[PDB]
């Protein structure tokens, strides 16, 4: 049984905080850790959601819908699962379908919803729900989606075949320099590893 | 189309720092962002590595070797891929094999090495390698390893063909959380069947 002993504020910004965390190990020694925390969430099951969108069309391979967007901390573009903070009072499933439509224009159905999972455990306390969402690419709504992005949001949609995800990801990075998100790569990696 | 303009320090810690980032959007408008950066080092292909350890035995289905460890920012224990910063001058492959060994006691072989991938693009510039490592669980060495040292890491081996449900089982406990990359991997294992 290891414990949080105390949490010291080091600096507060609007969106994110830097804290000094004092905890103690099974030996009984007090140690410290520099933790990052979002000031964004309070009461909820998690900060946000990540959406795994599976574009399903008859007589076709399933596509995985990914987004491409500039990330200021990375100082460059990244390939990611559609994601965003859960609003106040919203279910993970609802935030998932909302975010997906906002960024890609696709309207999907909930397939499954994960427990809250750590985004960056060794550095921060951000948790998310990973929501798998199927998209009927044959239904009339999804024939041609329309993104409804916010002010600061410029999002490009990228669909890659599920049956060949890992190599298509490597292909994109060959054509230009962008960085695949770790959750996306892990997903792609397991697809080839399975069986 | 979007570019970094300037990045000014807001507070610097011993390992990790907080910066404010100024950039320009495609329209030409100037915006800002609060970025987290490790002060630890820039020489590498990436900040660290995550190891996907595949326990291979002739009489069993492959296990995935995971670790359970207390994470102060989470204020609780987390189930993760063996991971750690890459030392300086060390290859991703070497750090992977080193880290896997330190945490689990297993000695493995490199299967494949990924490109640098972002840990948390909307918050930080941390990049890592996902290095796939096979473990000969039939070999005498690995009969049952002992994890080499300063911290406290519990080893958990779970069947690959049944990873996700075994993960959901463990995580229902009080402060035990599955890492997002671990869960994404497990999700894909199940979607693929
Ligand atoms: C911010 N910070 C540290 O980053 C730190 C730390 N204490 C330590 N260590 C841990 C290793 N032994 C010496 C002590 N470290 C290094 C470390 N531990 N875990 C990772 C890791 C895990 C996953 C990934 Cl993907 C990456 Cl890139 C890094 O980094 N303290 C006290 C701290 O505030
Ligand atoms: C630290 N920080 C922000 O977190 C921030 C931010 N500006 C904003 N917004 C963007 C949305 N519209 C209004 C402004 N946000 C909110 C936000 N943007 N992206 C996520 C997100 C992405 C992925 C995941 Cl997995 C999660 Cl859990 C969260 O959160 N600025 C300037 C900032 O420094």
Author numbering:
A (entry chain B): 14 to 208
B (entry chain A): 14 to 161, 164 to 208
Question: What does the article say, verbatim?
Answer:
NUDT5 (and NUDT9) catalyze the breakdown of ADPR to ribose-5-phosphate (R5P) and adenosine 5′-monophosphate (AMP), which permits recovery of NAD+ pools after DNA damage and poly(ADPR) polymerase (PARP) activation. In addition, NUDT5 was recently shown to be responsible for the production of PAR-mediated nuclear ATP and, thus, subsequent ATP-dependent chromatin remodeling and gene regulation following progestin or estrogen stimulation in breast cancer cells. Distinct from MTH1, NUDT5 had negligible activity against all tested oxidized and canonical nucleoside diphosphate and triphosphate species but catalyzed efficient turnover of ADPR.
Of the evaluated inhibitors, compounds 25 (TH5423, MG assay IC50 = 54 nM), 26 (TH5424, MG assay IC50 = 39 nM) and 28 (TH5427, MG assay IC50 = 29 nM) showed the most stabilization of NUDT5 in cell lysates. ITDRFCETSA illustrated that TH5427 was the most potent stabilizer under the described conditions with an apparent EC50 of 2.1 µM. A crystal structure was obtained with TH5427 in the active site of NUDT5. TH5427 bound in a similar fashion to TH1713, with the same primary coordinating interactions. The theophylline moiety is anchored in place by stacking interactions between Trp28 (chain A) and Trp46 (chain B) and two hydrogen bonds are observed between the theophyline carbonyl oxygen atoms and the amide nitrogen of Glu47 (chain B) and the guanidinyl group of Arg51 (chain A). As expected, the piperazine moiety extended out from the active site while the dichlorobenzene tail extended deep into a hydrophobic pocket in a static position. Overall, the orientations of TH1713 and TH5427 were very similar and the additional functionality at the tail and 8-positions did not cause drastic changes in the binding modality. Of particular interest, TH5427 had no effect on NUDT9-mediated hydrolysis of ADPR, indicating discrimination amongst ADP-ribose hydrolases. Ensuing dose-response analysis for MTH1 gave an IC50 of 20 µM (cf. 29 nM for NUDT5), which results in an apparent 690-fold selectivity for NUDT5 over MTH1 in vitro.
